Amino acid sequence: GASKLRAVLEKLKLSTAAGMVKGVVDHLLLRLKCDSAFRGVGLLNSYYEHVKISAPNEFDVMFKLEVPRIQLEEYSNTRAYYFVKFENPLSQFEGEILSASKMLSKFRKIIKEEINDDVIMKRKPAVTLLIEKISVDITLALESKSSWPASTQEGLRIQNWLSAKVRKQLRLKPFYLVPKHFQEETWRLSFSHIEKEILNNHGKSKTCCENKEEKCCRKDCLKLMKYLLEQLKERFKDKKHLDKFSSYHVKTAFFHVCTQNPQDSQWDRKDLGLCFDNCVTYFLQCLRTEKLENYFIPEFNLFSSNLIDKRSKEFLTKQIEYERNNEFPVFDEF
Amino acid sequence: ASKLRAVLEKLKLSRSTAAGMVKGVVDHLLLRLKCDFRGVGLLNEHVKISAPNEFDVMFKLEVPRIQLEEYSNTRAYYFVKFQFLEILSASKMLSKFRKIIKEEINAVTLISVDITLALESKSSWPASTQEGLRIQNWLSAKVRKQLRLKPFYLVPKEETWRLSFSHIEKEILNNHGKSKTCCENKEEKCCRKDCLKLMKYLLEQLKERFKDKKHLDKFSSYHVKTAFFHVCTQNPQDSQWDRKDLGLCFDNCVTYFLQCLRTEKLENYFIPEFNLFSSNLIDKRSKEFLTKQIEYERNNEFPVFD
Ligand SMILES: O=C(O)[C@H]1O[C@@H](Oc2cc3oc(-c4ccccc4)cc(=O)c3c(O)c2O)[C@H](O)[C@@H](O)[C@@H]1O
Ligand SMILES: O=C(O)[C@H]1O[C@@H](Oc2cc3oc(-c4ccccc4)cc(=O)c3c(O)c2O)[C@H](O)[C@@H](O)[C@@H]1O
Ligand SMILES: [Zn+2]
Numbered sequence: 263g264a265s266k267l268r269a270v271l272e273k274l275k276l277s278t279a280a281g282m283v284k285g286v287v288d289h290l291l292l293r294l295k296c297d298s299a300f301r302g303v304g305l306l307n308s309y310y311e312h313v314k315i316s317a318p319n320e321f322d323v324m325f326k327l328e329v330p331r332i333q334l335e336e337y338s339n340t341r342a343y344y345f346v347k348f349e350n351p352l353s354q355f356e357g358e359i360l361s362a363s364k365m366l367s368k369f370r371k372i373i374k375e376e377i378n379d380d381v382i383m384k385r386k387p388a389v390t391l392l393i394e395k396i397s398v399d400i401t402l403a404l405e406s407k408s409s410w411p412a413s414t415q416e417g418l419r420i421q422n423w424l425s426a427k428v429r430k431q432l433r434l435k436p437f438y439l440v441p442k443h444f445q446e447e448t449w450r451l452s453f454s455h456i457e458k459e460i461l462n463n464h465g466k467s468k469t470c471c472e473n474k475e476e477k478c479c480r481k482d483c484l485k486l487m488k489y490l491l492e493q494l495k496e497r498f499k500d501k502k503h504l505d506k507f508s509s510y511h512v513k514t515a516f517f518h519v520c521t522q523n524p525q526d527s528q529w530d531r532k533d534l535g536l537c538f539d540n541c542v543t544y545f546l547q548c549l550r551t552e553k554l555e556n557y558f559i560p561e562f563n564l565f566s567s568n569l570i571d572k573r574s575k576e577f578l579t580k581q582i583e584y585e586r587n588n589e590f591p592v593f594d595e596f
Numbered sequence: 597a598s599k600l601r602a603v604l605e606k607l608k609l610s611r612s613t614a615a616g617m618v619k620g621v622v623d624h625l626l627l628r629l630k631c632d633f634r635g636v637g638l639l640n641e642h643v644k645i646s647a648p649n650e651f652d653v654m655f656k657l658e659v660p661r662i663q664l665e666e667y668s669n670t671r672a673y674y675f676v677k678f679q680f681l682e683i684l685s686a687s688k689m690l691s692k693f694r695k696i697i698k699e700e701i702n703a704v705t706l707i708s709v710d711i712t713l714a715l716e717s718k719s720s721w722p723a724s725t726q727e728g729l730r731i732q733n734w735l736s737a738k739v740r741k742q743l744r745l746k747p748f749y750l751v752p753k754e755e756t757w758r759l760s761f762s763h764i765e766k767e768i769l770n771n772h773g774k775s776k777t778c779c780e781n782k783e784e785k786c787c788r789k790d791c792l793k794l795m796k797y798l799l800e801q802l803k804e805r806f807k808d809k810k811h812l813d814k815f816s817s818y819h820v821k822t823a824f825f826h827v828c829t830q831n832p833q834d835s836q837w838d839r840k841d842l843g844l845c846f847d848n849c850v851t852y853f854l855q856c857l858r859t860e861k862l863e864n865y866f867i868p869e870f871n872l873f874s875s876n877l878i879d880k881r882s883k884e885f886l887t888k889q890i891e892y893e894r895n896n897e898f899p900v901f902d
């Protein structure tokens with residue numbers, strides 16, 4: 263049944279837009295540099311990213327800003343949410359803690375004025391613009407070149423996959439803090455950039471996927487997992503069952519399967535059927551066990567009972583098991 | 597090969613009470629250099645293996661945007677255009693560098709420590725390197741593209757500068773496998789670095805034995821390191837470097853170096869048109885002498901190692 267997967271992958275591979283977003287981002291960055299508080303702003307990464315396989319018109323860029331000397335306070339033992347504490351341009355923003363809401367209020371404000379020179383902002387992903395066909399969600403992230411927080415100490419378990427040498431190099435790179443609530447003055451750790459590095463450099467062999475003898479199927483199974491969820495999230499668009507599931511969950515599940523099957527020979531493209539089945543099976547195992555460790559913060563359980571109700575897990579579990587037992591009808595359904 | 601592992605073990609014993617002082621001097625030297633040389637700083641060493649008291653450091657200075665003019669089809673020697681401007685004088689630039697250094701004491705060599713001045717350029721590599729660094733089937737094209745986005749450096753040595761890629765060499769050696777986990781576990785221990793060490797040690801011992809003849813004066817550990825890199829291009833797989841095969845592997849390294857001596861060809865690993873073993877650089881008599889000495893060593897289980 264694998265050739266239907268390649269058929270689905272063939273269609274995804276094919277599905278002037280990027281020119282318009284590049285221009286708007288260029289204008290937004292330049293005027294954001296005008297402000298004292300957002301002076302060192304630029305693109306983090308390459309001004310494009312499609313979190314949605316199925317939505318080529320839905321872009322997502324991230325604006326980064328370095329915070330030279332911060333001290334983080336772990337909010338209430340969540341391991342992933344922190345207060346940002348510290349001649350500094352950001353003291354315009356509530357006590358000792360840097361206010362996410364105030365910093366987002368000014369960020370939204372400057373962009374709302376900038377697009378008036380038809381780009382439209384949606385109602386209060388800090389900002390999402392509609393350029394009337396293209397959506398672009400802009401996120402503000404704080405950059406810190408200091409060493410990673412202690413909660414990331416046992417994460418990124420890639421030593422047996424991409425090597426301990428690589429893991430030590432990745433951890434020397436900066437981490438990022440993004441605003442999200444609860445105590446609405448918290449920032450959440452973000453390692454978006456590392457995952458992009460890992461995916462585009464995914465093999466144990468440095469020449470993985472650079473010749474016919476070493477063609478893997480890691481990227482293909484990830485795309486098919488994200489597509490599988492995206493279709494299911496849309497089939498139940500109207501209802502609310504799958505609103506708390508994201509592509510971050512399928513991507514986190516994928517990296518764990520990469521840790522579990524580190525050799526390239528376990529990802530031979532001739533066996534796309536079984537590997538993709540194996541990844542569907544792991545993601546289902548996490549749904550039932552209600553355990554899905556954040557790949558970088560192992561004590562942060564993405565599938566906790568306090569974040570996602572077992573009702574929704576049991577629902578998503580039955581949808582996926584029906585698809586897998588029936589050659590995935592949802593792939594050609596829309 | 598059990599004699600090779602014996603040599604390698606003795607080589608490790610002579611390798612830590614020394615770096616603490618040279619770290620203090622070098623770090624302190626970079627202050628009075630920042631006085632005038634504002635953006636100067638360390639780039640990264642033991643270029644000579646059997647001399648653990650000699651150390652080589654490199655002081656790197658980024659010249660912002662330069663124009664490189666190739667000197668006389670050398671493809672490796674360049675004139676740098678945009679104080680010491682006459683073209684940038686390496687003579688006068690080293691004069692002000694040696695002046696300050698020798699002053700704060702109270703190129704330039706200070707337990708011996710030889711400090712080199714290098715210019716950094718964050719621009720694209722010169723066109724003479726376009727077909728060099730052929731690591732594509734060994735370390736991958738991704739790694740090649742990433743390494744060529746690193747800066748290149750120019751060093752002083754009829755008033756020119758020479759391209760320097762020693763920083764790329766150090767990275768490739770310490771991240772040397774097609775596998776990313778090569779030499780990180782018992783199932784993947786290779787012998788590349790051991791072969792390079794033995795190649796370097798063999799030549800330095802021969803240079804010491806025949807120092808009164810001056811036949812080997814024009815030979816360096818750089819040619820040994822250059823030939824070793826071509827051999828890794830010839831044998832890109834880690835299974836051709838199994839530590840159980842250190843005997844055959846070392847014999848393969850010696851054999852290629854000999855073939856470069858006999859045919860008098862040894863391309864710079866980054867500048868393929870720069871022939872290190874050319875007639876205008878090393879007399880054929882010296883090549884045949886070094887060839888004869890190495891062959892006698894190889895035929896008699898290397899009597900220069902004990
Ligand atoms: O993969 C994605 O979809 C996006 O993931 C973003 O990072 C996180 C997103 C996340 O999204 C969710 C999430 C989002 C929507 C619905 C349910 C859950 C939960 C997380 O715990 C979560 C997280 O811990 C992250 O670090 C990145 O900042 C972003 O760049 C990336 O595109
Ligand atoms: O490996 C080493 O020993 C040294 O290698 C230096 O690079 C070169 C050295 C070189 O040394 C020689 C050389 C040295 C001594 C005797 C005969 C020849 C010739 C070269 O063409 C040459 C070269 O083209 C280099 O690029 C590096 O710039 C230097 O940092 C390093 O110490
Ligand atoms: Zn691959």
Ligand SMILES: [Zn+2]
Pocket residue numbers: 772773778779784785786787788
């Ligand atoms: Zn190795």
